[PDB]
Design a protein around this nucleic acid. Structure first.
Lengths: 180, 124, 262
RNA sequence: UGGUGACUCUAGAUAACCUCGGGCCGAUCGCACGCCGGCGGCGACGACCCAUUCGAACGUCUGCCCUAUCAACUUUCGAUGGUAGUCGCCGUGCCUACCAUGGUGACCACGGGUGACGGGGAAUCAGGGUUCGAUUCCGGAGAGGGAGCCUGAGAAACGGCUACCACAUCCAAGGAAGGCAGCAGGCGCGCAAAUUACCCACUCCCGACCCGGGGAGGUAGUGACGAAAAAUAACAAUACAGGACUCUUUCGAGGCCCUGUAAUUGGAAUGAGUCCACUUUAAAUCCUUUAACGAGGAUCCAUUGGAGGGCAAGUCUGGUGCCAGCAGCCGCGGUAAUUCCAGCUCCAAUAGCGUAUAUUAAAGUUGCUGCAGUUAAAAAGCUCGUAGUUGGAUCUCUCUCGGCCGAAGCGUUUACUUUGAAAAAA
RNA sequence: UACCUGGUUGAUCCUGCCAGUAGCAUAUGCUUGUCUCAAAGAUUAAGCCAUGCAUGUCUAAGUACGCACGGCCGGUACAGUGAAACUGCGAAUGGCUCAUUAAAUCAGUUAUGGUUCCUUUGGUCGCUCGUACUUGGAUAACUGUGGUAAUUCU
């Protein structure tokens, strides 16, 4: 007996066919266009979208006045609208099945700091996030996979201690100034 | 630039003769504030002597902003000595832990199980 | 296993205690007492987890050994004392009194009562028997025995005990149209008027209860506790008055509270 | 008296009994206290008994893997039942005596196997399903193997005892002592699994106890079982190259958006690491925080498998010459080998990747959903026949009432379907 | 995501399996920078085990003539702290493991109106018509003499 917990799950699934040329092309397109590190990030987003589709499909089989369908579908649609993936006017379970993987990849903190103009590119965005140059609201966020919420979208700054934000120019600038 | 103390979830524990609170420390550009500095800041903030203030469990958040811990303000030093954990008193220099180890005490106890009578005091 | 067990595992503890799965391996095994193991609330859970008066079991021990906690008017120093339904917990140092009464979610609430309400409690009579020269005796749900009860009090009724004296002062019959709480099962914590009782000889009787909001439900006769005569309770009810809201109504109320608060 | 659906219940009355090993009805203890001596608060402890508080024990109903190359088993010495008893905490063939001849079985008894503790549950899975569950929760069992007990509320207890069997320690040979499937640790076994560490601070437990103890448990150590997040670079300026939603002219003019060996140039950024002080904590460590140093071949260098097909990516070069080897399969190699050994280049996943084996899907190749059986594997030589399975049509306002106005069924049973209770957590 | 692909022929269409394919579990190989969780002598041997530890326990409230300390008076019965010891309680819980075990265990359901139940809690506890302003004998701890090579022997 221990006071520990052993709850853990995988956040991705590897594809059944390892060398499907079309799938390789689409996954590489996504990686390059969103500045991802590997295929596992694509598969992670694919898996969360797939589980959302599974939940929506399970709920759509139910009666339209089932309290469980109403409650859980409303919760799922609310969670989708809150993260900015689903439009607030498209608040029906059938619009969940129309969602695409690029809708979730557009809400990443990396994509958002590239779109907001804080970075010259998407790879610059990733290296800027991992280097503690970006804060969300008041909190410094280190994780490029941080899914930015709609209310949190408008507060993404350069952090109050970064050379690009507040003061204290970095180690290289200080060394250069000292050397002359 | 100044360290700022805030008190979040305050309660007057008359059962344990103290006040309990969740302490928030704002130190935007400094390391985690020492427990002493927090004790004098709370003593100033609650108009008490610093030695009835016991603060612990200070977790600094990610990013270098605030630190959150817990604090007790006792009615008097005697009540603090009666109610505080011995280790939190020893942190203030008010208690001395036993100078021996677990192994020494255990093997001594098992050695005296062999002798009977007043000879039980001769083994050590 | 030989002999009785003396430990309770954290995950095997009653769910309504609302304990973590990471703050240790063990849950406080309640002591033997007036209430069952799975239907009680240990004093350590109440003082530490509920009221936050202690952060450890050692601080609960200090509070209880200073003789500050009274349960049904008597000082209890046992930190694993099983406190249960309708009990009164008095803390005179802080001058508060609580009654152990279920929420609609089936969990004991922190229900503060007035110091004048803390002078009595309600007990469901579990049995009545005549003994030893014909003296009637009554046994309640607190395992407390009362001699010479009113010859009108029967099983399943409710009696109002004065805690100072231990004597019966008033009683409510088990009849239709009387208010009752549910003290077990799926409908635990709900309050409503008894509408019907289906007698099943050789088996469990089933009692139907109608909510104050028109909702109806059923329980076993052992899960019914007559709270008040008619539709007026004899004790102060918790925040929710025994009305179990569906998940949708609870979500709507939470959203309204968020709008009003922020 | 009261209670249950139901007592041979509870309570009451009478006549007696009341165990040497004998039943309770208090010769116990603390604190605060004041008279001619009286009275008395609040406790501690203890004892019959009644109250299911924690249980335990024994029963009811239903459900368990493979096997017929296991078809009859039990009945002597209890096997099924009846009567009386014994024993037991009690019901009981539990055990005796007598009596009856019963009891189970093709709806699979009995026997054998299990690399079988059972369940919650796990992996995989379109709908069905298949496989697993020693393993932290619940229940059971055991403490080298058997057996028998003491104490006790509770044990057939093993960090109790007694003996035997096996093993084994010390001895001055007389004797004495033993039980890690507890925590570490050792040997052995193996394909296969970590420290003879710190602490009662947390969670709880035990005791006469606010105070002592706890290898339960927590903390750290070893740890690529496995799971989550996530570096190994980003940017700008010149030279190319590309396109332009530029002139247009397929000659060309072209810092509009782009791309590269520049192994060109340049500064900006940062954490891996070192280290200080906090913070953490029982004491530490680890995260988190702060300062100092910390990047250009940012040498602070990413690997594991592949490049004929299946299956993504070289009939490029050198060597070898049915050799050495590759190759899951097809196949390659016998003098340009797209396949071996290498160099270069390329691609797949990536702090991971290959190999072996078990298993799931793929397998509609075990088919209930859902397979086949003329010729590919397959319908008994042919009928009868018990069980099993499957079976044609047909039947459309009644018990005491102060709301036709509380109620009863005494009548015709189930399957099905819907509902309501009750149903550990994880 | 309810998916297939190579291989029997000179070629074709099949049955059909072999081999590919993805997960999951153990092992193993090569490689390994940061960080958070986290399994771990089950499989073979319920095989054998050196050593240490894992179960003890006192309140104002059972028994204190151990100066072992020790006084706000010492003809004070007992100031107080208090080792040892007698007494009470626990040691039947926990922890480990999966050998046995095939209607056995176990799960859901139900029953004890067929039993026992330390402890907790509540009730009962002058209900008996027949030295008490307190009865008896010991035995530990302690003092002292010892036996055995040897034990938590005595």
């Amino acid at each position: 007996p221990v006071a520990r917990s052993w709850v853990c799950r995988k956040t991705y699934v590897t594809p059944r066919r390892p060398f499907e040329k079309s799938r390789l092309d689409q996954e590489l397109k996504l990686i390059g266009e969103y500045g991802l590190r590997n295929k596992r990030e694509v598969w992670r987003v694919k898996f969360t979208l797939a589980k959302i589709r599974k939940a929506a499909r399970e709920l759509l089989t139910l009666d339209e006045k089932d309290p469980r369908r109403l409650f859980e579908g409303n919760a799922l649609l609310r969670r989708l609208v809150r993260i900015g993936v689903l439009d607030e006017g498209k608040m029906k379970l059938d619009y969940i099945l129309g969602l695409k993987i690029e809708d979730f990849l557009e809400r990443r903190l990396q994509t958002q700091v590239f779109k907001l103009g804080l970075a010259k590119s998407i790879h610059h965005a990733r290296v800027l996030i991992r280097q503690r140059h970006i804060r969300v609201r008041k909190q410094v966020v280190n994780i490029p996979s941080f899914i930015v919420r709609l209310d949190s979208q408008k507060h993404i700054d350069f952090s109050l201690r970064s050379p690009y934000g507040g003061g204290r120019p970095g180690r290289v600038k200080r060394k250069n100034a000292k050397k002359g | 630039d100044t360290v700022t103390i805030r008190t979040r979830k305050f309660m007057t524990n008359r059962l344990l003769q103290r006040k309990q609170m969740v302490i928030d420390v704002l130190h935007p550009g400094k390391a985690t504030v020492p427990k002493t500095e927090i004790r004098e800041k709370l003593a100033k903030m609650y108009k008490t002597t610093p030695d009835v203030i016991f603060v612990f469990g200070f977790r600094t958040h990610f990013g270098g902003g605030k630190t959150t811990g817990f604090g007790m303000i006792y009615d008097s030093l005697d009540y603090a000595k009666k109610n505080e954990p011995k280790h939190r008193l020893a942190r203030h220099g008010l208690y001395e832990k036993k100078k021996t180890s677990r192994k020494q005490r255990k093997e001594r106890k098992n050695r005296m199980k062999k002798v009977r009578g007043t000879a039980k005091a001769n083994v050590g | 296993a030989r002999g009785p067990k003396k430990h309770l595992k954290r995950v095997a503890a009653p769910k309504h205690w609302m304990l973590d799965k990471l703050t240790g391996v063990f849950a406080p095994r309640p002591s033997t007492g007036p209430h069952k193991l799975r239907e009680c609330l240990p004093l350590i859970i109440f003082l530490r987890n509920r009221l936050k008066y202690a952060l450890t079991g050692d601080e609960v021990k200090k509070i209880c050994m200073q003789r500050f906690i009274k349960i049904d008017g008597k000082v209890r120093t046992d930190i694993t004392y099983p406190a249960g339904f309708m009990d009164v917990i008095s803390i005179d140092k802080t001058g508060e009194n609580f009654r152990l009464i279920y929420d609609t979610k089936g969990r004991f609430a922190v229900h503060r009562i007035t110091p004048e309400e803390a002078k009595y409690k309600l007990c469901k009579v579990r049995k009545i028997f005549v003994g030893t020269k014909g003296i009637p005796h009554l046994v309640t749900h607190d395992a407390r025995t009362i001699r010479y009860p009113d010859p009108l009090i029967k099983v399943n009724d409710t009696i109002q005990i004065d805690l100072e004296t231990g004597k019966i002062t008033d009683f409510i019959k088990f009849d239709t149209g009387n208010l009752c709480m549910v003290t077990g099962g799926a409908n635990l914590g709900r309050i409503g008027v008894i509408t019907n009782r289906e007698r099943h000889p050789g088996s469990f009787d089933v009692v139907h209860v109608k909510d104050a909001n028109g909702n109806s439900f059923a329980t076993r006769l052992s899960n019914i506790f007559v709270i008040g005569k008619g539709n007026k309770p004899w004790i102060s009810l918790p925040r929710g008055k025994g009305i179990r809201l569906t998940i949708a109504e609870e979500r709507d109320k939470r959203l309204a509270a968020k709008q009003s608060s922020g």
